[PDB]
Symmetry: D2
Subunit: 461 residues, 4 copies
Amino acid sequence: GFTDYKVADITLAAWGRRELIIAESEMPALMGLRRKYAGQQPLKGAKILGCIHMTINTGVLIETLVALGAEVRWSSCNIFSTQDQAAAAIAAAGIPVFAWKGETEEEYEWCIEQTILKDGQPWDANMVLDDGGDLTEILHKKYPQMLERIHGITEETTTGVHRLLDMLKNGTLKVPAINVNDSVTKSKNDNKYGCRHSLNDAIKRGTDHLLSGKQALVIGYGDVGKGSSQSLRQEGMIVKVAEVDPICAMQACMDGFEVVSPYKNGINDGTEASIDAALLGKIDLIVTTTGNVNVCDANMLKALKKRAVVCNIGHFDNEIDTAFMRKNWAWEEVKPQVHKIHRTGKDGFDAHNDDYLILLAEGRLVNLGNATGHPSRIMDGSFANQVLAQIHLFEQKYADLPAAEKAKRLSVEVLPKKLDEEVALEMVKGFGGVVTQLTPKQAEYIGVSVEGPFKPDTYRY
Amino acid sequence: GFTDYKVADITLAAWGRRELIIAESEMPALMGLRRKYAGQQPLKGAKILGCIHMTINTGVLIETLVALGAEVRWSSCNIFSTQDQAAAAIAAAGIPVFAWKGETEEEYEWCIEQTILKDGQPWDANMVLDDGGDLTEILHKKYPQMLERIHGITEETTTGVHRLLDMLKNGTLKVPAINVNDSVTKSKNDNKYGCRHSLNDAIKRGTDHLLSGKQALVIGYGDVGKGSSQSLRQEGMIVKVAEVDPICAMQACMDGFEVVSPYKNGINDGTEASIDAALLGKIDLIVTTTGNVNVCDANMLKALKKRAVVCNIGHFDNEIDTAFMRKNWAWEEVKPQVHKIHRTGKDGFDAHNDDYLILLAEGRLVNLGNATGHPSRIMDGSFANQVLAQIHLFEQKYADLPAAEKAKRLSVEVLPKKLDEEVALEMVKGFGGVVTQLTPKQAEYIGVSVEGPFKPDTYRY
Amino acid sequence: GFTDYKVADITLAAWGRRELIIAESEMPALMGLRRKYAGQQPLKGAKILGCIHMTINTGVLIETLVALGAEVRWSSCNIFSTQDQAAAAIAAAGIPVFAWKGETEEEYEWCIEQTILKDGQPWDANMVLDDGGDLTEILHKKYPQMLERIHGITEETTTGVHRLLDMLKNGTLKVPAINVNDSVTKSKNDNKYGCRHSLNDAIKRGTDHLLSGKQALVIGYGDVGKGSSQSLRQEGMIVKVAEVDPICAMQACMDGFEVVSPYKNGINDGTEASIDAALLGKIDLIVTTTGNVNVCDANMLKALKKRAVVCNIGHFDNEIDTAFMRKNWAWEEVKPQVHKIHRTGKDGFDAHNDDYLILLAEGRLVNLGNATGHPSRIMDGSFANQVLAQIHLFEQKYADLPAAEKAKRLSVEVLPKKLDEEVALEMVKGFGGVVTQLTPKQAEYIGVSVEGPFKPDTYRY
Amino acid sequence: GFTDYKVADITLAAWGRRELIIAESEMPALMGLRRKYAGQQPLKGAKILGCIHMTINTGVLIETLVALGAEVRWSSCNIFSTQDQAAAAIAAAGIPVFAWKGETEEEYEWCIEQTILKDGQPWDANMVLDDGGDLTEILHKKYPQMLERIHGITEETTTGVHRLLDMLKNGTLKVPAINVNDSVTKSKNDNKYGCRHSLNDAIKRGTDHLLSGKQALVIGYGDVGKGSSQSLRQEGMIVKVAEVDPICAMQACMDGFEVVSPYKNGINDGTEASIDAALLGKIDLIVTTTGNVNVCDANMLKALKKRAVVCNIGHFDNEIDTAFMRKNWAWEEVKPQVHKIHRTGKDGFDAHNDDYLILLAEGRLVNLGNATGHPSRIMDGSFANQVLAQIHLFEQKYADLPAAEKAKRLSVEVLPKKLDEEVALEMVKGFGGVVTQLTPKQAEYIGVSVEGPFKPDTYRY
Ligand SMILES: NC(=O)c1ccc[n+]([C@@H]2O[C@H](COP(=O)([O-])OP(=O)(O)OC[C@H]3O[C@@H](n4cnc5c(N)ncnc54)[C@H](O)[C@@H]3O)[C@@H](O)[C@H]2O)c1
Ligand SMILES: NC(=O)c1ccc[n+]([C@@H]2O[C@H](COP(=O)([O-])OP(=O)(O)OC[C@H]3O[C@@H](n4cnc5c(N)ncnc54)[C@H](O)[C@@H]3O)[C@@H](O)[C@H]2O)c1
Ligand SMILES: NC(=O)c1ccc[n+]([C@@H]2O[C@H](COP(=O)([O-])OP(=O)(O)OC[C@H]3O[C@@H](n4cnc5c(N)ncnc54)[C@H](O)[C@@H]3O)[C@@H](O)[C@H]2O)c1
Ligand SMILES: NC(=O)c1ccc[n+]([C@@H]2O[C@H](COP(=O)([O-])OP(=O)(O)OC[C@H]3O[C@@H](n4cnc5c(N)ncnc54)[C@H](O)[C@@H]3O)[C@@H](O)[C@H]2O)c1
Ligand SMILES: [K+]
């Protein structure tokens, strides 16, 4: 009588387990950490509140933390990102999970609240694993007494890290954090390479549109923007890129993209007159990658080519003005996480209207909403960093320090480069790669240990 | 009656000037600095010792320094890198230059000495611009009294910066330096993007070999390694990548390369038995990108496929064991900077022998040796950074500081990110790119100025 | 009272209709033919037996034939290729269709028989539209009297055309045929470009495996082999190609692939000793593209790397020896159209066994089995040719000709180049492409009409 | 005392011979024919007039014909395409050659006349090997008595074949011809793959412009158009394609290019009003690939972006209206085969004028004019077909046939597919490729011999 969960359908558990057993074989860094730390049980006594996309790959992360001695209570950090078979398999292993694909916002907040509370009172949580900072925000705003007993937060994504750095600048951050996002084996692998794989995947599963010879506009050329632009270009899309960062824009130019603005002269003065109508009238696909607000705005959405696809692969749906479309336009569901938005008016639509946009995942993370997110062998890097981060903060035991000692340890840090390299080495062995060992003369010549680290902390890769 | 120069042929000057006038139109960041700072003359009184490849692009750099008020004495930092028409055009403008393509080592040292000495006595130099640290080493070892009057060094390349950091660690660095290499508008565009353009260029000019469907082995996957691997892959080469750094190896895997070692299990124990002879017997082309020593060693060269091409695009020729080849094997010149190395023995060779390797530029920087180096629009980024760096150190006037104040300013620094972004923006405008301006609400949301900088100094791009 | 159909679930009709209304906007050549021929009703009196994948795109073909005056009875030409929502939408429009995803072989033959028979007696069919020749074979073997009244066959695919040309060579072909496969707007668009899109799509939806930096072996480098190889290479797979045709092999080399054989020196003498076990032990994915038999044989399947993916994108499953695997090895269903094949024995498997292959769609057409086949904008070209072919043969009225006149018209022909060009132009306009008009002087200079055709019938494109 | 030649510089012979010895190692199909036919001397008594680019690769073809028993008299078919070291090496072997880089039109005609006449009277020629039909035209118009004793013409290129088929249609063709162009091992390898290698090579050697992130317009998308578009796209150019042929335009769309016309709605009426000035004002590089006349016309040249590069890789310079530019605009030589065309007027120019175009090779074949043409390993396929063609027509002995027998053999034919496959196999072995042998059951299943041919003559590859 394990009942401490809520999932779409517990009978998907056997299916979820089959996919976890496959995913294991694609995740050598994560499975390496299981084998290495199994005996030592470095997370014995850890009580982890987890808020991250309840996928099969997140399942292998959860079962790694549990194998190392942790107990967890889990939710998803997105309403559309759960794989119901993954959620079912985790619940079936006797692990509290509150996640299903297609939550309401009310259900999303309820799921996070079910991790935080056990039998209607605060859980004895002492660790937080977060992706986007929604759980971190609720603990700070609603459960400050719970943070007194928490040793730290391990934050997955750019948007979550920004929110931590704001709290730290404001003196409101209550416990230390590891920025998992800025391990090279996370930010390069997941933020960039993962989006090369999963963006075109999500747009095919959502639309089945030919992308070859069609026109895309990618907003942003950070790690997600670079991966997303490549995802489309490798399918033969004509990709244009927008940026606010001239260094990122210069990279897009050198990578073979045309750098354009949705605005005449790049000036976003909020007028319809500012919109480059000729440019947006040629676009078949717009993708937002920024982590910023309203980068695909009402006037852009009015100007887009009839039957353009619109999607967001940044963390939050507010990249796109979906509030404007809900207010002004009629939404026809094609199938789950695919809507035609009829720009003819609010009150009904003609079934044969030609004047619509296709919105994926209601503007939520499209790679998780309309596909399965990044493949296991990429999520291996991210999640091995999460396990190492959890071990590091748990072992430091911030909550048990005196006030004077807390003041010295209250920071947002990254993992050491040596760990980043050890994750990378396990990932390279999963491709059958063979890394060359430096001779002592070579190691002396470039001024590094034969064991590494191989690069100064300033190296960009 | 200007005689204070030595070049291959002064009669090439008019041709050099025609190419400078074209190169100017490709270099908007550099030409922007001319237009911005012409009036202010920020380098009035600067006396710059320059040691960097005497190309047409280096011509535009020199004439920008001179336009902003500097006097210079110039040499090349490589025996094969000079474009004799560029050297001629600079000499003909009355600028002391000592450079020609195909110097001896004795002539190379003589050319640097001719910049350092004017009329048989040390020049009143107060600035150094170096690429690889050869001029910096000579000043420190042979002319220490000259360093008392020098305000700083602006160093171009990975290898030069390593040598500076060794001097700083040892307390032997006598003047402050700017690491120009680690501006993003240098390291990304020059070290990576430039090698995508110029590596396959140099191999075509040197060999005219079909690259499509042939096997390459690229040693290293730093910025040069990445740009080099792409240069060959985009021609349809089957590229294998060797690495000591598991993070760089992981990037090569994710980029779609097989990661291999020249040694069995990556162990370089110095025996012929350690060589993967099966692997090296399949390789048509080997490129060294490391800035390390002996990464293509004698035992690798013995095992390479008959008639493989061998080249280096790292700073120094000692990446390849050319000394072994000179000692043991017979060199046939095909044409300038192309040798067949006959592995039949050290004396004669038969013109029809099938057992040879093709060496490019005698193992020197192949893109400058067998072609013209990076295109103007790439060198624009590097050289705009060099001008800003020269202005910054010259204006700081280190040599004039009191002893106590010197101690505080003796460092190896990079340029501020705002200047990096300003160079990037001028490069983007040269592609006709339009950068979007943040609204005040967007800038607040991501926590930056509308004017930038847009990223923290920890951002990797 | 319409009951003359069998589909998985009639309640999927509305969803199918929403997808048909979208697919119409992607299919300008097909929807152009509707608009052009609607008034003339050129297929009034046509009674078409259709046997082709019951997808949404096939829906737009069926409704185009019906819009031009035809009546049809439909089946799928593959047990896994049906989209149940497409089948439902067609049945709901009152069109007899006998198709669902995941038919047995017994159900497959029953569905074709339900098109051929209406109320237990032969339908008054006078046209055949076939894909692979299964319906054509049944009519010739079992219903020869029905062929007396049939005007022609329009055959979609390479394998079907081969079977027709065998019948013609043997004098057993009873009615004339159009080879739709060898229109350029079919063979290029569908056989090549379509597989660039749909192969990587099907492998992602089936496995979610990272393809980047993994090793593939593509068997064949015809049109499907070329499009398949590109599908994997553009994801950053290391693709090796097998071929029997040295001209196709030369194209694979020049395209940047290594050409290998599963057999030592290419000799398939049927011994285990002949297998290149070193090569097949490195392969992560094998794809069959040949239309030939047993090109991924028992001994190859034994030698494949543990946990390799195995799939077929040729017409028939017998490219792979799946009969050997059913006989010898235990099948674990992961999810629909995905099996683990446990090489440890027949009568059970360890749930944690590491020694398995992943088979997609039981060796059936993977792009249709594990995804949705080619996108609408590609299937537009194929299906526009099918409509024109149906019109041409129906209007020729072979079945009504005298015996002497029949003898002259009994042939397998292609559509004229002018019609091929008119399809191409409609497809170009769907990308917003603008085709240049020849001047009279230019048309004279290259010896063509300003209206085309632009190339002789020998031109290969 | 051999004096029966004219070359730039006989002293370049040793250098030419060194390059021939290297080129031979890259040309296994050609060197295979030497080894196979050496004993049999199948061209003993052949007297071949040769008109084709006097490159190193042409040198290997010449010396193959001579090795098989032929005598030759050679000229280049282009004023800029000779490699003077190749010409020197051939003259030094005692082979009559009349070729240098940078001929006048008057010199070009003189060189062809020196092959046709020996000691002021017609040579005893009995074979023609032509590339573009200039030698074929002169023999027909000026030396009809010579054609009486000639057994055939072997024609290299699209333009030459068009001219032959015009003579055949008009009944003016005097001797049979083999169309070498339409061997798959010529048209795919040379026309398409070769231009991927040599177009970007010629543009880098000529201009050293960065192509990444810059805009290209390619006129035509036949074999040369396809290879040229890829050449630029693989460098990261934004490539727009123009076509008259909707099937070729459809291919460019599917390959990921935007298809545009220099003319509004594709209509040229020869008004300035018809020019898309907005489009041509954005183009950095225009390349003509058509074999047509005036496809880059006066009004296009007026509208091109300032400092755009203009070049032609079709056979004849009349693709570009260079006559207009010679009449109206001032030509400043940058260096050999590179001009700035000053659009300010005819008389002088300002050295610092910004309103110029860069023209390569005065609009002659850019890959041969500004580089070396295709690499040896590609020219191997073309030239092996030339040798087989020469053997076939020489052995048929047309000139010796009775009039009735001539009438039956007067055609323009291709080589049999079996020979095309045998050339391909030798090229595949040069990449180390291993071609699979069909089993007897597989050969039965697809209806081919185990020895081939593998495809019907209608197959497009
Ligand atoms: N979907 C995924 O799987 C996935 C994975 C990683 C991260 N993310 C999320 O995606 C977002 C992007 O992450 P990142 O790592 O690429 O961040 P990043 O900071 O590296 O990149 C964001 C880029 O957006 C640009 N930008 C900002 N405002 C803009 C504007 N108005 N118009 C144009 N460009 C603008 C910035 O200049 C910057 O280069 C975040 O919300 C992150 O948390 C998603
Ligand atoms: N040719 C050019 O135009 C050009 C341009 C920029 C810099 N450079 C020179 O190229 C070199 C590389 O510069 P970079 O910026 O790429 O440096 P980097 O430090 O970014 O890259 C060097 C890489 O080599 C790898 N490496 C070291 N020893 C190795 C070994 N034994 N086997 C395999 N890999 C090994 C390191 O792990 C590292 O990733 C330097 O010498 C630099 O000065 C040349
Ligand atoms: N999945 C789809 O969407 C789709 C679309 C079009 C056609 N098809 C089917 O795909 C198959 C291939 O069609 P195609 O048009 O590419 O045919 P094709 O004849 O152009 O190509 C088949 C190739 O297989 C090669 N080959 C044959 N036996 C081989 C062997 N034993 N080993 C290696 N290579 C071998 C041949 O030399 C040939 O080049 C057919 O069965 C066709 O009906 C499927
Ligand atoms: N430079 C080289 O190395 C090389 C090699 C082979 C052939 N060639 C020459 O290059 C030319 C092209 O040969 P090919 O085999 O590609 O011929 P092709 O017939 O395959 O292609 C030429 C294309 O030009 C298009 N075209 C014609 N007029 C046009 C116009 N006004 N605007 C746009 N497109 C137009 C045609 O539709 C056609 O598709 C010929 O002159 C040929 O002899 C050059
Ligand atoms: K020697």
